[PDB]
A paper describes a structure:
It has two catalytic sites, each comprised of the bipartite ε-subunit whose two domains embrace the nucleotide-binding eIF2γ enforcing a conformation that favors GDP dissociation and exchange with GTP.
The overall binding modes of eIF2(αP) in these structures are similar to those previously observed (Adomavicius et al., 2019; Gordiyenko et al., 2019; Kashiwagi et al., 2019; Kenner et al., 2019), and the subunits’ conformation in the αPγ complex are almost identical to those in previous structures (Kashiwagi et al., 2019), but with improved resolution. When the apo eIF2B and αPγ complex structures are compared, the binding of eIF2(αP) is associated with an en bloc rearrangement of the βδγε tetrameric unit of eIF2B. As a consequence, the Cα atoms of eIF2Bδ helix α3 (helix δ-α3, residues 247–267), which intensively interact with the eIF2α-NTD at the eIF2Bδ-side of the gap, are displaced 3.2 Å (on average) and its helical axis is rotated 7.9° away from eIF2Bβ (the root-mean-square deviation [RMSD] for the alignment of eIF2Bβ is 0.7 Å). Contacts between the γ-subunit of eIF2(αP) and eIF2Bγ observed in the αPγ complex may contribute to this difference, but their significance needs further exploration.
Author numbering:
A (entry chain I): 41 to 467
B (entry chain F): 1 to 11, 28 to 134, 155 to 238, 258 to 295, 342 to 444
C (entry chain G): 166 to 518
D (entry chain C): 8 to 98, 126 to 351
């Protein structure tokens, strides 16, 4: 049978506020490319071809950009249906909705908005198939996950995962997050279930590439009380007395799938995809034939779009996706950056770890750090910033003005810790 | 040397084979001249002469008091313990080549060790050497509490409810001392070891080094279990029935018997072991069970799965079924029922 | 007594003479647990030694010497039997055990040879515990002098070389290089670092940790990619797990190759080493002393492809893990040592004295 | 005619991600096939239009994955063929037929390549001698286990440390009973004294005689030049490409940095960039022998074929 993949392009961890004001979450430029693109290239890599995307909040801009998709070409292998429904705000309803129109034939692979991945599901896909039809629907879900180590910057302060699993069929036994739990709690339910070895793990990522089966749309319709996948899995893990038909977990070893959630996660995944950690996917492969993403990979992980006019003596040690249209002056010391298109720079500037974007601009001698910007975001002479110091929506900063850490300024007083300005204070 | 085969054994090496003596025997096979063997002095001296009844030129006998818990008797014998001890429990009947556990110990400077053949769910490491948790359902109701620290350091844990440990603990002198000041810690197996593992986390830290086993075990309240042992025992008796007045006509099926014993006519034995120097010589049959001596046997013992210990008798009309022979059986005919009965 | 573990399978036809050991034949699988003839601390050492829990040659020295401190202090002489003879006589089976669990490195070799020389040294008017206490003191004097103070001196020499702006290549668990880099970084220098590792006992990790956890920016790559990095490196910098007689320098499997690719890319080859490691046998050849540790570990991991499903059933396939190569003198121009920044070909003189 | 476009996609994709096809000469064959389809599913006012079209297509091809330029030179030679046909037979329409046969001709010659090389083997390697090889280069498995039916000798295969890519050949020569050995690349200079003539695979032949090889080869060739034992390139001539090393250093397939330092390693991956080039350079001045479809050849010799195979005016493609 074909391999169809439900997909929702509004991850309800609505954290990229105020950034979510101008352009929606999913459309975000990570490395001058749509995350949703990364996801779609993934879907094509594992070879699925009938993908059902979904966006409720701000579906307009989604279609606006995705009409010219790498997979919205007539030659594409993937067919897409942006069902522009603005009723649900929890995945529960969209899963009962793919129930409500019998879209998924059978054996689908649901996926959140902006998973960064290179994973070949086919190994999983087939073992799922095996223990689902050589076992006749005793499965409902076969979670896929990716081995890691806790200390990595993939698991930010916010989100980790810890899970009890079996070791014979690798079936899930319990799933739970660990936002500040110096201890944990596992019931002997585990062992009164079976006396042949049980495993606990804290070294799987929040891969969020759940394989599933339309009877998951069943398990969501039959009980209208689930609003997220974790709701699903813990409800089914407690409802094992009857009609559980538990999850058959499975971990990979060689790939990299992360459901980017928070600005720290975006940070980590961007400055790991520049390091080719996911390759095939990296903008010098220009996987979206979209023109201006011609990225002339070069010495020592320095990427370089065409026509960057890099400034004299501007050292750039590593991992600098200088996008198209850029221009740079003398001594501009960039590092780990992502300089999008339309980025004029001054002199003596340092931009360690920064993430500029399109439209951005900056004058001379303007040290920055750990930063982030957005469309026409501007900071003039001798400004300075600090970790997570977002600033978007064309915000400006005046000369001489240092700024503190969380300086998330934007086009709104009430939500940003500043407002659209051309100084520092005074909205 | 660096050890002492101190044996925490209380309470007899029954059968056609000196069972209780066998932990000694086996450690004796691999060096270990010294064997501290605590005895039973809750009433009288009923255990030491029983060791004078044995054949190891280097054994030692230790009297005791009313009640001696494991760590309690540890603290008791503590002074004469002047090395890294090697404690050991009563019913070691297990062909484990002990070189593996002391191997692991002598390797990773282990503050402890133990064994586990295949209550008491445990968490063992990925590599299966540095265990990380032990408990039982008695300890706590249901919540497998594991302090997030260790999962934040030791990444992947396998579990084990399918275990039969053998209470064998290679130690280190300073842990014996750490116990000697801990007057309240009564028993090693129940409280000490889990306390130490609890204190594994707040290289000069401590260690715990378990081991999975699939060869033999430690006997408990069902001693008919070690009939397994009996069936297997003769293999242990390769160079370390076997010698008796045999009949070669009566049923011999995985049997065992000592010399100068019940040799008569018209008997049988099916898949079990026997006693030594008792009265079983009349018209008899198998009992698929084991017996101790001084139990006059006669008239076709149609029994199955029981014990005929001392203080028993039967003659000329006898028949039984899974009814153990305890004390107070001056019997000659008592048709028994296979349910729980010890007459 | 102590049998010799089986030379695992067959070697390269040429390699038929050197030994090829394993780790599952844990020699204590047969001995008597209360270590009666074999010394307790000694057998503990050898057991944690063969299974691969002590790697860094200098660390392996430190370990052996601690264990022999313990042996000495526990030693007793027989009734009025002279120490210098009877001790060493107990020692010979102990060193034979250390060999038959793992081949002995030039560092341990010079160590044990010094110890024989010094045990034989102290006169036969020896108050027993006095002799043993003086020996413990002298042993610790040795270690502090030659491997605990040396590192300091080597760093003091090196720091004045490493400039600012200049990346440096490293190779492997060499404690000395990790120390040099860490120190001369702490004294304020500013430079990238690149590490190169060689499978199977992938070890560059050790230094990679002890560097990135110390602040210095790193960059990793395996030695079959070394030819890539050299158009950037301004100094290779290599450990030396032994130093031979004829000017050459022995090291792990992946050293002389680094030096060679370097000379062909014209980049100045340093090395760092401390005196007492220096052996005295001579070798410009390659197969005269290169122990063959358990080759079975080599088998790779891909897909489900253990491309060496059997080392054995494939009688047309033979493995090896040459532990050491030997950079010829000419290549490695500068060999820093606690006596100075000497050039390589002149190393036998300042070490023969 | 869109079915052509869909096959073009199918390829371009299978190309644009990773191993496909896992054989090189295969890649050549599917290439030529797709090219034949471009011709037979199109027409042209003048052959110049077909030159133009196939040049656009080859641009997409080589620009997509410039790490494997085999198909680059296949479209180069097809441009040569059309150039030659429009040269001869107009120096107009029926010549399409002409074109087709050329392909078949080229095609069928390709189908013999491996076996051709076989015939050379039985000459060079005199028995009971030691040959060194880095990789599973199919041509060399052909070479050796086709010269291991009259003699016996000893081949030591190194291992590209990224993969086990230098072990499959060990298991194969085991399946051919030659008593071969495995080793770890860092030890090649260790045993380079006891080699006789290294037999190496190759992945391209630049117009400078400088072969771009599977990684861990520059060191092999350097050790060779040092010991001055000769280099046996097992390069079928279709693997040529008229690239001259120095352009933009889009030069080494940078594979998933997951290979060298897998992701299991904690936080140290926050200030530790990684490199892993699977394809390295070897300077031509170390080459000795281009064992090839037409027997022995030397470095300089190579541009002769680059003189004749691909018309020089299209290395910019």
């Amino acid at each position: 049978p074909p391999l169809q993949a439900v997909l929702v392009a509004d991850s309800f961890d609505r954290r990229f506020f105020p950034i979510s004001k101008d352009q929606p979450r999913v459309l975000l430029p990570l490395a001058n490319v749509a995350l949703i693109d990364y996801t779609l290239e993934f879907l094509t890599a594992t070879g699925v071809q009938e993908t059902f995307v979904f966006c409720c909040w701000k579906a307009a801009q989604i279609k606006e950009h995705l009409l010219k998709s790498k997979w919205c070409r007539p030659t594409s292998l993937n067919v897409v249906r942006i069902i522009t429904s603005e009723l649900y705000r929890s995945l529960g309803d969209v899963l009962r909705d793919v129930d409500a129109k019998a879209l998924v034939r059978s054996d689908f692979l649901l996926v959140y908005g902006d998973v960064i991945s290179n994973i070949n599901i086919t190994r999983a896909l087939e073992e799922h198939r095996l223990r689902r039809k050589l076992e006749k629907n005793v499965s409902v879900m076969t979670m896929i996950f990716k081995e890691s180590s806790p200390s990595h910057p993939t698991r930010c302060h916010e989100d980790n995962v810890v899970v009890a699993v079996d070791s014979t069929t690798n079936r899930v036994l319990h799933f739970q997050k660990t936002q500040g739990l110096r201890r944990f709690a596992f019931p002997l339910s585990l062992f009164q279930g079976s006396s042949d070895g049980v495993e606990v793990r804290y070294d799987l990522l929040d891969c969020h590439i759940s394989i599933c089966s339309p009877q998951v749309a069943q398990l969501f319709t039959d009980n209208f009380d689930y609003q997220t996948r974790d709701d699903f899995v813990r409800g089914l893990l407690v409802n094992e007395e009857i009609l559980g038909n538990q999850i058959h977990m499975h971990v990979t070893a060689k790939e990299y799938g992360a459901r980017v959630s928070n600005l720290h996660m975006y940070s980590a995944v961007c400055a790991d995809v520049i390091r080719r950690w996911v390759y095939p996917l990296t903008p010098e492969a220009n996987f979206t034939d979209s023109t201006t993403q011609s990225c002339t990979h070069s010495r020592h992980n320095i990427y370089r779009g065409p026509e960057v006019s890099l400034g004299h003596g501007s050292i750039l040690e590593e991992n600098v996706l200088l996008g198209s249209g850029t221009v740079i002056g003398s001594n501009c010391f960039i590092t780990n950056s992502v300089i999008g298109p339309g980025c004029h720079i001054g002199d003596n500037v340092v931009l360690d770890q920064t993430y500029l974007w399109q439209g951005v601009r900056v004058a001379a001698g303007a040290q920055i750090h750990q930063s982030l910007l957005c469309d026409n975001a501007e900071v003039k002479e001798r400004v300075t910033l600090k970790p997570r110091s977002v600033l978007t929506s064309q915000v400006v900063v005046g000369p001489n003005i240092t700024l503190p850490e969380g300086s998330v300024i934007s086009l709104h007083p009430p939500d940003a810790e500043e407002d659209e300005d051309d100084g520092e204070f005074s909205d | 040397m660096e050890f002492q085969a101190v044996v925490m054994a209380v309470g007899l090496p029954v059968g056609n084979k000196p069972l209780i003596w066998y932990p000694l025997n086996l450690l004796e096979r691999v060096g270990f001249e010294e064997v501290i063997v605590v005895t039973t002095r809750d009433v009288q001296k009923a255990l030491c002469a029983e060791f004078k009844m044995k054949m190891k030129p280097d054994i030692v006998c230790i009297p005791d008091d009313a009640d001696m818990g494991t760590a309690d008797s540890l603290r008791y014998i503590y002074p004469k313990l002047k090395t890294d001890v090697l404690v050991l429990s009563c019913d070691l009947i297990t062909d484990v080549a002990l070189h593996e556990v002391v191997d692991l110990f002598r390797a990773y400077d282990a503050s402890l060790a133990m064994l586990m053949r295949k209550r008491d769910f445990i968490g063992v490491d990925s590599t299966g050497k540095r265990l990380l948790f032990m408990a039982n359902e008695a300890d706590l109701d249901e919540e497998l509490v594991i302090k997030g620290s260790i999962l934040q350091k030791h990444p992947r844990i396998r579990f084990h409810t399918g275990l039969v440990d053998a209470h064998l603990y290679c130690l280190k002198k300073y842990i014996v001392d750490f116990l000697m000041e801990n007057g309240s810690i009564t028993s090693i197996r129940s409280e000490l070891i889990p306390y130490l593992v609890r204190k594994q986390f707040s290289l000069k830290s401590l260690d715990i080094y378990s081991f999975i086993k699939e060869a033999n075990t430690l006997n408990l309240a069902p001693y008919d279990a070690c009939w397994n042992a009996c069936r297997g025992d003769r293999w242990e008796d390769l160079s370390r029935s076997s010698a008796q007045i045999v009949s070669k006509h009566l049923v011999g099926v995985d049997s065992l018997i000592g010399p100068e014993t019940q040799i008569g006519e018209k008997s049988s034995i099916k898949r079990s072991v026997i006693g030594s120097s008792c009265l079983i010589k009349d018209r008899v049959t198998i009992t698929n069970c084991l017996l101790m001596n001084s139990v006059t046997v006669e008239e076709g013992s149609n029994i199955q799965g029981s014990v005929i210990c001392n203080n028993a008798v039967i003659e000329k009309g006898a028949d039984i079924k899974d009814c153990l022979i305890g004390s107070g059986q001056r019997i000659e005919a008592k048709a028994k029922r296979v349910n729980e009965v010890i007459v | 007594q102590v049998p010799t573990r089986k030379d695992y399978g067959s070697k390269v036809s040429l390699f038929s003479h050197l030994p090829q050991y394993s780790r599952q034949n844990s020699l204590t699988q047969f001995m008597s647990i209360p270590s009666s003839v074999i010394h307790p601390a000694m057998v503990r050492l050898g057991l944690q030694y063969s299974q691969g829990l002590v790697s860094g040659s200098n660390a392996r020295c430190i370990a052996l010497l601690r264990a022999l401190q313990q042996v000495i202090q526990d030693y007793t002489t027989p009734p009025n039997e002279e120490l210098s003879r009877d001790l060493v006589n107990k020692l010979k089976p102990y060193m034979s055990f250390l060999t038959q669990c793992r081949p002995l490195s030039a560092s341990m070799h010079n160590a044990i040879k010094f110890l024989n020389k010094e045990i034989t040294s102290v006169g036969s008017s020896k108050r027993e515990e006095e002799a043993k206490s003086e020996l413990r003191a002298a042993i610790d004097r040795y270690v502090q002098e030659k491997i605990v103070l040396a590192a300091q001196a080597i760093s003091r020499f090196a720091y004045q070389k490493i400039s600012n702006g200049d990346v440096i290549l490293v190779y492997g668990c060499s404690s000395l290089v990790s120390r040099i880099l860490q120190e001369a970084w702490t004294e304020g220098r500013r430079f990238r670092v690149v590490v190169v590792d060689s499978r199977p006992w992938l070890e560059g990790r050790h230094t990679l940790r002890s560097l990135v956890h110390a602040g210095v920016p790193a960059s990793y790559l395996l030695i079959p990619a070394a030819s890539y990095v050299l158009p950037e490196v301004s100094k290779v910098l290599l450990g030396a797990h032994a130093l031979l007689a004829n000017g050459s320098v022995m090291s792990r499997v992946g050293t002389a190759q680094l030096a060679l690719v370097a000379r062909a890319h014209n980049v100045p080859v340093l090395v760092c080493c401390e005196t007492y490691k220096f052996c005295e046998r001579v070798q410009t050849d390659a197969f005269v002393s290169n122990e063959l540790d358990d080759p079975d570990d080599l088998q790779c991991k891909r897909g489900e492809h253990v491309a060496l499903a059997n080392w054995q059933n494939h009688a047309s396939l033979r493995l090896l893990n040459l532990v050491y190569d030997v950079t010829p003198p000419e290549l490695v121009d500068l060999v820093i040592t606690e006596l100075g920044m000497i050039p390589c070909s002149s190393v036998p003189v300042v070490l023969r004295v | 005619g869109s079915e052509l476009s869909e096959r073009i996609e199918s390829f371009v994709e299978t190309l644009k991600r990773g191993g496909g096809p896992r054989s090189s000469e295969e890649m050549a064959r599917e290439t030529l096939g797709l090219l034949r389809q471009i011709i037979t599913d199109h027409r042209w006012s003048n052959a110049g239009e077909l030159m133009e079209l196939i040049r656009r297509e080859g641009r997409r091809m080589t620009a997509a994955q410039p790490s494997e330029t085999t198909v680059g030179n296949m479209v180069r030679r097809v441009l040569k063929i059309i150039r030659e046909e429009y040269g001869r037979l107009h120096g107009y329409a029926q010549l399409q037929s002409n074109i087709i046969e050329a392909i078949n001709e080229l095609l069928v010659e390709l189908e013999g390549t491996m076996e051709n090389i076989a015939a050379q083997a039985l000459e060079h390697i005199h028995s009971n001698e030691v040959i060194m090889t880095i990789g599973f280069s199919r041509t060399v498995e052909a070479f050796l286990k086709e010269a291991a039916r009259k003699r016996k000798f000893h081949v030591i295969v190194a291992e590209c440390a990224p993969f086990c890519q230098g072990h499959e050949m060990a298991v194969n020569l085991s399946k051919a009973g030659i008593e071969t050995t495995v080793m770890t690349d860092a030890a090649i200079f260790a045993v380079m004294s006891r080699v006789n003539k290294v037999i190496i695979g190759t992945k391209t032949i630049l117009a400078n005689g400088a072969l771009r090889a599977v990684t861990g080869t520059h060191t092999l060739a350097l050790a060779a030049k040092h010991h001055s034992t000769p280099l046996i390139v097992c390069a079928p001539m279709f693997k040529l490409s008229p690239q001259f090393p120095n352009e933009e250093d889009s030069f080494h397939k940078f594979v998933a940095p997951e290979e060298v330092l897998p992701f299991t390693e904690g936080d140290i991956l926050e200030k530790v960039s990684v490199h892993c080039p699977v394809f390295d350079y070897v300077p031509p001045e170390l080459i000795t022998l281009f064992i090839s479809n037409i027997g022995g050849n030397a470095p300089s010799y190579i541009y002769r074929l680059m003189s004749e195979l691909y018309h020089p005016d299209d290395h910019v493609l």
